[PDB]
PDB file of all heavy atoms in Angstrom:
ATOM      1  N   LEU A   3     -12.939 -10.814   0.202  1.00 40.53           N
ATOM      2  CA  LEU A   3     -13.121  -9.675   1.091  1.00 40.53           C
ATOM      3  C   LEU A   3     -13.885 -10.086   2.341  1.00 40.53           C
ATOM      4  O   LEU A   3     -13.559  -9.638   3.445  1.00 40.53           O
ATOM      5  CB  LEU A   3     -13.838  -8.541   0.358  1.00 40.53           C
ATOM      6  CG  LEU A   3     -14.151  -7.299   1.190  1.00 40.53           C
ATOM      7  CD1 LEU A   3     -12.871  -6.690   1.732  1.00 40.53           C
ATOM      8  CD2 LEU A   3     -14.903  -6.285   0.352  1.00 40.53           C
ATOM      9  N   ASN A   4     -14.951 -10.875   2.177  1.00 37.90           N
ATOM     10  CA  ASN A   4     -15.729 -11.294   3.337  1.00 37.90           C
ATOM     11  C   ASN A   4     -14.873 -12.109   4.298  1.00 37.90           C
ATOM     12  O   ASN A   4     -14.998 -11.974   5.519  1.00 37.90           O
ATOM     13  CB  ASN A   4     -16.948 -12.097   2.888  1.00 37.90           C
ATOM     14  CG  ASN A   4     -18.032 -11.224   2.295  1.00 37.90           C
ATOM     15  OD1 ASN A   4     -18.806 -10.600   3.018  1.00 37.90           O
ATOM     16  ND2 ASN A   4     -18.092 -11.174   0.969  1.00 37.90           N
ATOM     17  N   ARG A   5     -13.971 -12.937   3.762  1.00 39.08           N
ATOM     18  CA  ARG A   5     -13.035 -13.678   4.603  1.00 39.08           C
ATOM     19  C   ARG A   5     -12.115 -12.738   5.368  1.00 39.08           C
ATOM     20  O   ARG A   5     -11.893 -12.906   6.576  1.00 39.08           O
ATOM     21  CB  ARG A   5     -12.211 -14.642   3.747  1.00 39.08           C
ATOM     22  CG  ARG A   5     -11.384 -15.653   4.538  1.00 39.08           C
ATOM     23  CD  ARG A   5     -12.158 -16.354   5.638  1.00 39.08           C
ATOM     24  NE  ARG A   5     -12.982 -17.441   5.127  1.00 39.08           N
ATOM     25  CZ  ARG A   5     -13.297 -18.524   5.830  1.00 39.08           C
ATOM     26  NH1 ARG A   5     -12.842 -18.666   7.067  1.00 39.08           N
ATOM     27  NH2 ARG A   5     -14.053 -19.470   5.291  1.00 39.08           N
ATOM     28  N   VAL A   6     -11.573 -11.730   4.678  1.00 39.88           N
ATOM     29  CA  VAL A   6     -10.688 -10.780   5.347  1.00 39.88           C
ATOM     30  C   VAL A   6     -11.432 -10.049   6.459  1.00 39.88           C
ATOM     31  O   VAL A   6     -10.923  -9.904   7.576  1.00 39.88           O
ATOM     32  CB  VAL A   6     -10.083  -9.795   4.329  1.00 39.88           C
ATOM     33  CG1 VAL A   6      -9.239  -8.751   5.043  1.00 39.88           C
ATOM     34  CG2 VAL A   6      -9.249 -10.540   3.299  1.00 39.88           C
ATOM     35  N   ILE A   7     -12.631  -9.545   6.160  1.00 42.11           N
ATOM     36  CA  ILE A   7     -13.395  -8.794   7.157  1.00 42.11           C
ATOM     37  C   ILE A   7     -13.765  -9.682   8.340  1.00 42.11           C
ATOM     38  O   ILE A   7     -13.714  -9.252   9.501  1.00 42.11           O
ATOM     39  CB  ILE A   7     -14.643  -8.169   6.510  1.00 42.11           C
ATOM     40  CG1 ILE A   7     -14.244  -7.217   5.384  1.00 42.11           C
ATOM     41  CG2 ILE A   7     -15.466  -7.429   7.549  1.00 42.11           C
ATOM     42  CD1 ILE A   7     -15.424  -6.625   4.642  1.00 42.11           C
ATOM     43  N   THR A   8     -14.139 -10.938   8.065  1.00 41.68           N
ATOM     44  CA  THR A   8     -14.426 -11.883   9.137  1.00 41.68           C
ATOM     45  C   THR A   8     -13.228 -12.039  10.059  1.00 41.68           C
ATOM     46  O   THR A   8     -13.355 -11.945  11.286  1.00 41.68           O
ATOM     47  CB  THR A   8     -14.837 -13.233   8.551  1.00 41.68           C
ATOM     48  OG1 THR A   8     -16.038 -13.076   7.782  1.00 41.68           O
ATOM     49  CG2 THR A   8     -15.084 -14.243   9.662  1.00 41.68           C
ATOM     50  N   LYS A   9     -12.052 -12.294   9.480  1.00 41.71           N
ATOM     51  CA  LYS A   9     -10.857 -12.468  10.299  1.00 41.71           C
ATOM     52  C   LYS A   9     -10.532 -11.199  11.081  1.00 41.71           C
ATOM     53  O   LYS A   9     -10.137 -11.266  12.251  1.00 41.71           O
ATOM     54  CB  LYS A   9      -9.678 -12.886   9.420  1.00 41.71           C
ATOM     55  CG  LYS A   9      -9.826 -14.274   8.823  1.00 41.71           C
ATOM     56  CD  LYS A   9      -9.878 -15.349   9.895  1.00 41.71           C
ATOM     57  CE  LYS A   9      -8.689 -15.244  10.840  1.00 41.71           C
ATOM     58  NZ  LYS A   9      -8.090 -16.580  11.120  1.00 41.71           N
ATOM     59  N   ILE A  10     -10.685 -10.034  10.445  1.00 39.24           N
ATOM     60  CA  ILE A  10     -10.399  -8.765  11.113  1.00 39.24           C
ATOM     61  C   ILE A  10     -11.297  -8.577  12.329  1.00 39.24           C
ATOM     62  O   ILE A  10     -10.836  -8.166  13.401  1.00 39.24           O
ATOM     63  CB  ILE A  10     -10.553  -7.594  10.123  1.00 39.24           C
ATOM     64  CG1 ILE A  10      -9.345  -7.501   9.193  1.00 39.24           C
ATOM     65  CG2 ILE A  10     -10.739  -6.276  10.867  1.00 39.24           C
ATOM     66  CD1 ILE A  10      -9.542  -6.515   8.053  1.00 39.24           C
ATOM     67  N   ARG A  11     -12.587  -8.890  12.192  1.00 37.13           N
ATOM     68  CA  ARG A  11     -13.515  -8.635  13.286  1.00 37.13           C
ATOM     69  C   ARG A  11     -13.532  -9.742  14.331  1.00 37.13           C
ATOM     70  O   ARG A  11     -14.204  -9.588  15.358  1.00 37.13           O
ATOM     71  CB  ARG A  11     -14.923  -8.387  12.746  1.00 37.13           C
ATOM     72  CG  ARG A  11     -15.029  -7.114  11.918  1.00 37.13           C
ATOM     73  CD  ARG A  11     -16.416  -6.514  12.032  1.00 37.13           C
ATOM     74  NE  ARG A  11     -16.396  -5.073  12.266  1.00 37.13           N
ATOM     75  CZ  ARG A  11     -17.488  -4.337  12.457  1.00 37.13           C
ATOM     76  NH1 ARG A  11     -18.684  -4.909  12.441  1.00 37.13           N
ATOM     77  NH2 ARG A  11     -17.386  -3.030  12.665  1.00 37.13           N
ATOM     78  N   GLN A  12     -12.828 -10.848  14.102  1.00 37.31           N
ATOM     79  CA  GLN A  12     -12.756 -11.901  15.104  1.00 37.31           C
ATOM     80  C   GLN A  12     -11.693 -11.625  16.158  1.00 37.31           C
ATOM     81  O   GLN A  12     -11.534 -12.430  17.081  1.00 37.31           O
ATOM     82  CB  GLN A  12     -12.489 -13.257  14.440  1.00 37.31           C
ATOM     83  CG  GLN A  12     -13.728 -13.909  13.839  1.00 37.31           C
ATOM     84  CD  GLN A  12     -13.399 -15.111  12.974  1.00 37.31           C
ATOM     85  OE1 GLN A  12     -12.258 -15.293  12.546  1.00 37.31           O
ATOM     86  NE2 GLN A  12     -14.400 -15.940  12.712  1.00 37.31           N
ATOM     87  N   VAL A  13     -10.971 -10.509  16.045  1.00 39.02           N
ATOM     88  CA  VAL A  13     -10.058 -10.049  17.081  1.00 39.02           C
ATOM     89  C   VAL A  13     -10.464  -8.645  17.510  1.00 39.02           C
ATOM     90  O   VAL A  13     -11.228  -7.953  16.831  1.00 39.02           O
ATOM     91  CB  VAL A  13      -8.589 -10.066  16.611  1.00 39.02           C
ATOM     92  CG1 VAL A  13      -8.057 -11.489  16.581  1.00 39.02           C
ATOM     93  CG2 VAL A  13      -8.462  -9.414  15.245  1.00 39.02           C
ATOM     94  N   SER A  14      -9.933  -8.227  18.658  1.00 41.97           N
ATOM     95  CA  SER A  14     -10.395  -7.037  19.362  1.00 41.97           C
ATOM     96  C   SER A  14      -9.458  -5.848  19.188  1.00 41.97           C
ATOM     97  O   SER A  14      -9.893  -4.767  18.781  1.00 41.97           O
ATOM     98  CB  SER A  14     -10.573  -7.345  20.854  1.00 41.97           C
ATOM     99  OG  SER A  14     -11.057  -8.663  21.048  1.00 41.97           O
ATOM    100  N   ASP A  15      -8.175  -6.032  19.488  1.00 40.51           N
ATOM    101  CA  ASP A  15      -7.221  -4.937  19.546  1.00 40.51           C
ATOM    102  C   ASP A  15      -6.675  -4.604  18.161  1.00 40.51           C
ATOM    103  O   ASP A  15      -6.676  -5.430  17.244  1.00 40.51           O
ATOM    104  CB  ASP A  15      -6.065  -5.288  20.480  1.00 40.51           C
ATOM    105  CG  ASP A  15      -5.200  -6.403  19.929  1.00 40.51           C
ATOM    106  OD1 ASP A  15      -5.578  -7.582  20.095  1.00 40.51           O
ATOM    107  OD2 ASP A  15      -4.164  -6.101  19.298  1.00 40.51           O
ATOM    108  N   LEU A  16      -6.219  -3.357  18.017  1.00 40.02           N
ATOM    109  CA  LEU A  16      -5.774  -2.865  16.718  1.00 40.02           C
ATOM    110  C   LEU A  16      -4.536  -3.594  16.205  1.00 40.02           C
ATOM    111  O   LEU A  16      -4.396  -3.788  14.992  1.00 40.02           O
ATOM    112  CB  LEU A  16      -5.500  -1.363  16.801  1.00 40.02           C
ATOM    113  CG  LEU A  16      -5.362  -0.594  15.485  1.00 40.02           C
ATOM    114  CD1 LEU A  16      -6.647  -0.678  14.675  1.00 40.02           C
ATOM    115  CD2 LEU A  16      -4.987   0.854  15.751  1.00 40.02           C
ATOM    116  N   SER A  18      -3.708  -6.798  16.694  1.00 40.38           N
ATOM    117  CA  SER A  18      -4.144  -8.071  16.133  1.00 40.38           C
ATOM    118  C   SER A  18      -4.829  -7.854  14.795  1.00 40.38           C
ATOM    119  O   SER A  18      -4.660  -8.652  13.866  1.00 40.38           O
ATOM    120  CB  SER A  18      -5.080  -8.787  17.105  1.00 40.38           C
ATOM    121  OG  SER A  18      -4.385  -9.214  18.263  1.00 40.38           O
ATOM    122  N   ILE A  19      -5.616  -6.783  14.684  1.00 42.81           N
ATOM    123  CA  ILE A  19      -6.272  -6.457  13.422  1.00 42.81           C
ATOM    124  C   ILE A  19      -5.233  -6.229  12.329  1.00 42.81           C
ATOM    125  O   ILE A  19      -5.350  -6.757  11.220  1.00 42.81           O
ATOM    126  CB  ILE A  19      -7.191  -5.237  13.599  1.00 42.81           C
ATOM    127  CG1 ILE A  19      -8.368  -5.594  14.510  1.00 42.81           C
ATOM    128  CG2 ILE A  19      -7.663  -4.716  12.251  1.00 42.81           C
ATOM    129  CD1 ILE A  19      -9.370  -4.480  14.687  1.00 42.81           C
ATOM    130  N   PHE A  20      -4.193  -5.446  12.637  1.00 41.99           N
ATOM    131  CA  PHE A  20      -3.124  -5.182  11.674  1.00 41.99           C
ATOM    132  C   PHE A  20      -2.427  -6.467  11.240  1.00 41.99           C
ATOM    133  O   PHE A  20      -2.207  -6.697  10.041  1.00 41.99           O
ATOM    134  CB  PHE A  20      -2.104  -4.214  12.282  1.00 41.99           C
ATOM    135  CG  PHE A  20      -2.545  -2.774  12.288  1.00 41.99           C
ATOM    136  CD1 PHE A  20      -3.849  -2.423  11.983  1.00 41.99           C
ATOM    137  CD2 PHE A  20      -1.648  -1.771  12.617  1.00 41.99           C
ATOM    138  CE1 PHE A  20      -4.243  -1.097  11.994  1.00 41.99           C
ATOM    139  CE2 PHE A  20      -2.035  -0.447  12.632  1.00 41.99           C
ATOM    140  CZ  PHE A  20      -3.333  -0.109  12.320  1.00 41.99           C
ATOM    141  N   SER A  21      -2.067  -7.316  12.205  1.00 42.80           N
ATOM    142  CA  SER A  21      -1.324  -8.526  11.868  1.00 42.80           C
ATOM    143  C   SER A  21      -2.179  -9.480  11.044  1.00 42.80           C
ATOM    144  O   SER A  21      -1.734  -9.998  10.009  1.00 42.80           O
ATOM    145  CB  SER A  21      -0.834  -9.210  13.144  1.00 42.80           C
ATOM    146  OG  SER A  21       0.187  -8.454  13.772  1.00 42.80           O
ATOM    147  N   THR A  22      -3.427  -9.698  11.474  1.00 39.40           N
ATOM    148  CA  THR A  22      -4.348 -10.537  10.718  1.00 39.40           C
ATOM    149  C   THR A  22      -4.566  -9.990   9.316  1.00 39.40           C
ATOM    150  O   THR A  22      -4.601 -10.753   8.346  1.00 39.40           O
ATOM    151  CB  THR A  22      -5.678 -10.651  11.462  1.00 39.40           C
ATOM    152  OG1 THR A  22      -5.458 -11.249  12.744  1.00 39.40           O
ATOM    153  CG2 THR A  22      -6.655 -11.504  10.681  1.00 39.40           C
ATOM    154  N   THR A  23      -4.705  -8.669   9.187  1.00 40.09           N
ATOM    155  CA  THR A  23      -4.939  -8.068   7.882  1.00 40.09           C
ATOM    156  C   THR A  23      -3.778  -8.328   6.939  1.00 40.09           C
ATOM    157  O   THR A  23      -3.979  -8.762   5.796  1.00 40.09           O
ATOM    158  CB  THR A  23      -5.172  -6.569   8.039  1.00 40.09           C
ATOM    159  OG1 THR A  23      -6.344  -6.349   8.836  1.00 40.09           O
ATOM    160  CG2 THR A  23      -5.339  -5.914   6.681  1.00 40.09           C
ATOM    161  N   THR A  24      -2.550  -8.046   7.393  1.00 36.57           N
ATOM    162  CA  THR A  24      -1.401  -8.246   6.515  1.00 36.57           C
ATOM    163  C   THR A  24      -1.234  -9.718   6.161  1.00 36.57           C
ATOM    164  O   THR A  24      -0.971 -10.053   4.998  1.00 36.57           O
ATOM    165  CB  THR A  24      -0.122  -7.695   7.154  1.00 36.57           C
ATOM    166  OG1 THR A  24       0.090  -8.310   8.431  1.00 36.57           O
ATOM    167  CG2 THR A  24      -0.211  -6.183   7.318  1.00 36.57           C
ATOM    168  N   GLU A  26      -3.624 -12.058   5.989  1.00 33.64           N
ATOM    169  CA  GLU A  26      -4.679 -12.528   5.104  1.00 33.64           C
ATOM    170  C   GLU A  26      -4.503 -11.974   3.701  1.00 33.64           C
ATOM    171  O   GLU A  26      -4.687 -12.701   2.721  1.00 33.64           O
ATOM    172  CB  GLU A  26      -6.056 -12.138   5.648  1.00 33.64           C
ATOM    173  CG  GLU A  26      -6.468 -12.797   6.954  1.00 33.64           C
ATOM    174  CD  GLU A  26      -6.301 -14.302   6.939  1.00 33.64           C
ATOM    175  OE1 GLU A  26      -6.648 -14.937   5.919  1.00 33.64           O
ATOM    176  OE2 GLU A  26      -5.835 -14.850   7.958  1.00 33.64           O
ATOM    177  N   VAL A  27      -4.141 -10.694   3.576  1.00 31.46           N
ATOM    178  CA  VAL A  27      -3.900 -10.140   2.246  1.00 31.46           C
ATOM    179  C   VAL A  27      -2.721 -10.831   1.570  1.00 31.46           C
ATOM    180  O   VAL A  27      -2.785 -11.174   0.379  1.00 31.46           O
ATOM    181  CB  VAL A  27      -3.682  -8.617   2.334  1.00 31.46           C
ATOM    182  CG1 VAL A  27      -3.230  -8.069   0.989  1.00 31.46           C
ATOM    183  CG2 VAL A  27      -4.960  -7.927   2.796  1.00 31.46           C
ATOM    184  N   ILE A  38       1.545  -2.374   6.505  1.00 34.37           N
ATOM    185  CA  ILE A  38       0.783  -1.209   6.938  1.00 34.37           C
ATOM    186  C   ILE A  38       1.774  -0.136   7.361  1.00 34.37           C
ATOM    187  O   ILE A  38       2.677  -0.397   8.167  1.00 34.37           O
ATOM    188  CB  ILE A  38      -0.190  -1.556   8.076  1.00 34.37           C
ATOM    189  CG1 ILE A  38      -1.270  -2.514   7.569  1.00 34.37           C
ATOM    190  CG2 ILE A  38      -0.828  -0.295   8.626  1.00 34.37           C
ATOM    191  CD1 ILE A  38      -1.993  -3.252   8.670  1.00 34.37           C
ATOM    192  N   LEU A 142      -1.608   1.084   2.782  1.00 17.83           N
ATOM    193  CA  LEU A 142      -1.569  -0.372   2.745  1.00 17.83           C
ATOM    194  C   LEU A 142      -0.854  -0.770   1.465  1.00 17.83           C
ATOM    195  O   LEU A 142      -1.304  -0.420   0.369  1.00 17.83           O
ATOM    196  CB  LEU A 142      -2.977  -0.964   2.793  1.00 17.83           C
ATOM    197  CG  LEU A 142      -3.072  -2.468   2.535  1.00 17.83           C
ATOM    198  CD1 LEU A 142      -2.415  -3.249   3.663  1.00 17.83           C
ATOM    199  CD2 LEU A 142      -4.523  -2.888   2.361  1.00 17.83           C
ATOM    200  N   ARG A 163     -10.684  -1.927  -0.476  1.00 23.71           N
ATOM    201  CA  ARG A 163     -11.743  -2.286   0.467  1.00 23.71           C
ATOM    202  C   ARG A 163     -11.156  -2.752   1.794  1.00 23.71           C
ATOM    203  O   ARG A 163     -11.682  -2.431   2.872  1.00 23.71           O
ATOM    204  CB  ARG A 163     -12.622  -3.384  -0.133  1.00 23.71           C
ATOM    205  CG  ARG A 163     -13.364  -2.989  -1.405  1.00 23.71           C
ATOM    206  CD  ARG A 163     -14.337  -1.842  -1.195  1.00 23.71           C
ATOM    207  NE  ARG A 163     -13.685  -0.535  -1.278  1.00 23.71           N
ATOM    208  CZ  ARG A 163     -13.170  -0.009  -2.387  1.00 23.71           C
ATOM    209  NH1 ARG A 163     -13.216  -0.673  -3.535  1.00 23.71           N
ATOM    210  NH2 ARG A 163     -12.604   1.190  -2.346  1.00 23.71           N
ATOM    211  N   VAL A 164     -10.045  -3.483   1.733  1.00 25.02           N
ATOM    212  CA  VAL A 164      -9.347  -3.891   2.948  1.00 25.02           C
ATOM    213  C   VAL A 164      -8.843  -2.662   3.693  1.00 25.02           C
ATOM    214  O   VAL A 164      -8.908  -2.594   4.926  1.00 25.02           O
ATOM    215  CB  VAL A 164      -8.203  -4.866   2.615  1.00 25.02           C
ATOM    216  CG1 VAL A 164      -7.386  -5.152   3.853  1.00 25.02           C
ATOM    217  CG2 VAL A 164      -8.757  -6.160   2.034  1.00 25.02           C
ATOM    218  N   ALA A 165      -8.286  -1.696   2.960  1.00 23.85           N
ATOM    219  CA  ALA A 165      -7.848  -0.455   3.585  1.00 23.85           C
ATOM    220  C   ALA A 165      -9.022   0.292   4.210  1.00 23.85           C
ATOM    221  O   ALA A 165      -8.872   0.930   5.255  1.00 23.85           O
ATOM    222  CB  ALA A 165      -7.134   0.424   2.561  1.00 23.85           C
ATOM    223  N   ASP A 166     -10.190   0.260   3.562  1.00 21.89           N
ATOM    224  CA  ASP A 166     -11.398   0.808   4.179  1.00 21.89           C
ATOM    225  C   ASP A 166     -11.664   0.163   5.536  1.00 21.89           C
ATOM    226  O   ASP A 166     -11.938   0.851   6.528  1.00 21.89           O
ATOM    227  CB  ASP A 166     -12.598   0.612   3.252  1.00 21.89           C
ATOM    228  CG  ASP A 166     -12.597   1.576   2.081  1.00 21.89           C
ATOM    229  OD1 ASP A 166     -11.834   2.566   2.123  1.00 21.89           O
ATOM    230  OD2 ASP A 166     -13.366   1.347   1.122  1.00 21.89           O
ATOM    231  N   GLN A 167     -11.596  -1.170   5.587  1.00 18.58           N
ATOM    232  CA  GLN A 167     -11.833  -1.878   6.846  1.00 18.58           C
ATOM    233  C   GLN A 167     -10.790  -1.520   7.902  1.00 18.58           C
ATOM    234  O   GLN A 167     -11.126  -1.321   9.077  1.00 18.58           O
ATOM    235  CB  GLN A 167     -11.849  -3.387   6.605  1.00 18.58           C
ATOM    236  CG  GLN A 167     -13.018  -3.862   5.773  1.00 18.58           C
ATOM    237  CD  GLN A 167     -14.337  -3.305   6.267  1.00 18.58           C
ATOM    238  OE1 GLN A 167     -14.758  -3.581   7.393  1.00 18.58           O
ATOM    239  NE2 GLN A 167     -14.997  -2.516   5.430  1.00 18.58           N
ATOM    240  N   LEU A 168      -9.517  -1.455   7.501  1.00 17.83           N
ATOM    241  CA  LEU A 168      -8.460  -0.996   8.398  1.00 17.83           C
ATOM    242  C   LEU A 168      -8.754   0.395   8.939  1.00 17.83           C
ATOM    243  O   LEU A 168      -8.566   0.663  10.129  1.00 17.83           O
ATOM    244  CB  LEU A 168      -7.111  -1.012   7.678  1.00 17.83           C
ATOM    245  CG  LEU A 168      -6.443  -2.370   7.478  1.00 17.83           C
ATOM    246  CD1 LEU A 168      -5.198  -2.211   6.621  1.00 17.83           C
ATOM    247  CD2 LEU A 168      -6.100  -2.986   8.821  1.00 17.83           C
ATOM    248  N   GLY A 169      -9.157   1.313   8.060  1.00 16.25           N
ATOM    249  CA  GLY A 169      -9.445   2.666   8.499  1.00 16.25           C
ATOM    250  C   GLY A 169     -10.581   2.708   9.500  1.00 16.25           C
ATOM    251  O   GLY A 169     -10.536   3.458  10.475  1.00 16.25           O
ATOM    252  N   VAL A 170     -11.622   1.908   9.260  1.00 16.72           N
ATOM    253  CA  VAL A 170     -12.734   1.820  10.204  1.00 16.72           C
ATOM    254  C   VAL A 170     -12.261   1.273  11.547  1.00 16.72           C
ATOM    255  O   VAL A 170     -12.668   1.760  12.609  1.00 16.72           O
ATOM    256  CB  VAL A 170     -13.870   0.967   9.608  1.00 16.72           C
ATOM    257  CG1 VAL A 170     -14.962   0.731  10.638  1.00 16.72           C
ATOM    258  CG2 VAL A 170     -14.443   1.639   8.371  1.00 16.72           C
ATOM    259  N   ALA A 171     -11.383   0.266  11.524  1.00 16.86           N
ATOM    260  CA  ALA A 171     -10.850  -0.281  12.772  1.00 16.86           C
ATOM    261  C   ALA A 171     -10.007   0.746  13.521  1.00 16.86           C
ATOM    262  O   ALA A 171     -10.091   0.854  14.750  1.00 16.86           O
ATOM    263  CB  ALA A 171     -10.032  -1.539  12.487  1.00 16.86           C
ATOM    264  N   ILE A 172      -9.201   1.524  12.796  1.00 18.83           N
ATOM    265  CA  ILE A 172      -8.401   2.570  13.428  1.00 18.83           C
ATOM    266  C   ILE A 172      -9.301   3.649  14.011  1.00 18.83           C
ATOM    267  O   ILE A 172      -9.062   4.150  15.115  1.00 18.83           O
ATOM    268  CB  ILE A 172      -7.389   3.153  12.423  1.00 18.83           C
ATOM    269  CG1 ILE A 172      -6.384   2.081  11.990  1.00 18.83           C
ATOM    270  CG2 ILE A 172      -6.674   4.356  13.018  1.00 18.83           C
ATOM    271  CD1 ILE A 172      -5.743   2.352  10.645  1.00 18.83           C
TER     272      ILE A 172
END
Side-chain angles (χ1 to χ4, degrees):
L3 177 60
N4 285 280
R5 191 48 80 151
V6 176
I7 300 177
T8 298
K9 292 297 307 224
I10 283 171
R11 294 210 134 183
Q12 280 169 342
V13 285
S14 324
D15 68 278
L16 195 61
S18 292
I19 293 183
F20 282 11
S21 290
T22 299
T23 298
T24 57
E26 294 310 317
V27 172
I38 294 161
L142 171 67
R163 297 298 84 68
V164 173
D166 285 346
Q167 293 311 297
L168 284 174
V170 173
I172 296 156

